[PDB]
Amino acid sequence: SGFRKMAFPSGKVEGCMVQVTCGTTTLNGLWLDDVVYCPRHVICTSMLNPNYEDLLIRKSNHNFLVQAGNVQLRVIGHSMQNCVLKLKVDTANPKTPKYKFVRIQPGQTFSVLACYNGSPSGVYQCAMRPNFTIKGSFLNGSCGSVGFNIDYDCVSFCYMHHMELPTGVHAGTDLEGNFYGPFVDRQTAQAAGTDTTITVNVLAWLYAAVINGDRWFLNRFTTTLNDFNLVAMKYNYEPLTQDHVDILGPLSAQTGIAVLDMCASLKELLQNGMNGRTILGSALLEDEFTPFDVVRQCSGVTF
């Protein structure tokens, strides 16, 4: 038993991490087969309004210093993939895992391997927020650090780090170089929109608390999907859908507590607070665990 914010084991990703330098700019790259992926802004030098097309036409293969430990990698081709650069190199990464590029949805979680100069510093879990930001831990040099999920032996890469927004939250792309959210890889006035609480996740985490013997917030009441959503909206909670109710099925079954019964507990925590009590060691309602995360950790699925 017990319930922790758990990241995927990072080894498979650590073996893909390289350093990419243009001029005085160093950041991280991801080396899979004979390609290195990094943020295209590695090629910026002065950048309120740069033209990346121009900047990339003016680069040559030999301008890109790529380092895998010591072993320098020779770049033999380059191309822009939206906001990512694909650096074709002369050698296929022998440590390349089974992998795929997947875009995630707001509410889904992934592990981040925070890297500096191609070197892994640490691993943590976060969620894609409803406003397409992530609440990460990123300093100067973390650009190109990636977010990922693991299923069996297969790494699903879902995020590459690009920037910090004024509120201290983070924005990036999928590995096809397409931004999550209305953000651009330029210095502009851009700010995170208003964020909401991921309702289905809070419900998953209340199920986790029950599976772990934290039961104090449970009540005999049930509510309707509509009367619940009436209260949720009031507190800046995402609407809950029949699809969400269906996804919470396995946890409903494991605990024998109907989803709409748990929604009655959530409505009451939203109206009355926790009255100086905690749930799974937290004094606030946690929303960065998906239904899958709770099943994975309360069942002991390995990779």
Ligand X SMILES: *[C@](O)(C(=O)NCc1ccccc1)[C@H](C[C@@H]1CCNC1=O)NC(=O)[C@H](CC1CC1)n1cccc(NC(=O)OC(C)(C)C)c1=O
Between 157 and 176, how does the x/- string for binding to ligand X read (CB under 6 A)?
Answer: -----xxx-x---x------
Active-site residue (options: 83, 126, 143, 263): 143
Sort 164 into a burial class: Cβ within 10 Å, 0-12 / 13-18 / 19+: middle
DSSP, res 121: E
Residue from 70, 140, 226, 272 touching ligand X (CB under 6 A): that is 140
Residue from 10, 109, 133, 142 touching ligand X (CB under 6 A): that is 142
DSSP bridge pairs for 161: 172
- Least gap, CB of 193 to a copy of itself (angstroms): 18
Residue with tokens 């609480």: 197
* Residues in contact with a copy of itself by the rule CB under 8 A: 1-12, 14-15, 113-117, 119-124, 126, 135-142, 164, 168-170, 212-213, 273, 276, 278, 281-284, 296-303
Between the CA of residue 233 and those of 239, 242, 283, what are the distances in Å?
7, 16, 21
Q: By CB under 6 A, is residue 40 in contact with ligand X?
A: no
Residue from 132, 138, 228, 237 touching ligand X (CB under 6 A): that is 138
Question: 256 is in the binding site of which of a copy of itself, ligand X, none (Cβ under 5 to 8 A by kind)?
Answer: none
Q: Which is nearer to a copy of itself, 213 or 256 (CB)?
A: 213
Question: 271 is in the binding site of which of a copy of itself, ligand X, none (Cβ under 5 to 8 A by kind)?
Answer: none
Q: Which residues of 177-207 are buried (b: 16+ CB within 10 A; e: fewer)?
A: bebbbebebeeeeeebeebbbbbbbbbbbbb
- Least gap, CB of 145 to ligand X (angstroms): 8
Between the CA of residue 200 and those of 28, 47, 133, 192, 239, what are the distances in Å?
34, 40, 18, 22, 9
Q: Which is nearer to a copy of itself, 152 or 242 (CB)?
A: 152
- Least gap, CB of 122 to a copy of itself (angstroms): 4
Residue from 57, 139, 189, 253 touching ligand X (CB under 6 A): that is 139
Dihedral over alpha carbons 223, 299, 102, 9 (to 10 degrees):
140
Count of all residues that appear for the chain in the document: 303
Closest CA to 30 of 150, 151, 177: 177
Look up 41 and say whether it is catalytic.
yes
Between the CA of residue 280 and those of 74, 167, 258, 267, 269, what are the distances in Å?
50, 28, 20, 18, 15
Q: Which is nearer to a copy of itself, 258 or 301 (CB)?
A: 301
- Least gap, CB of 53 to a copy of itself (angstroms): 31
What are the residue numbers of the active site? 41, 143
Using CB under 6 A, list all residues that contact ligand X: 26-27, 41, 138-143, 162-164, 166, 170, 185, 187
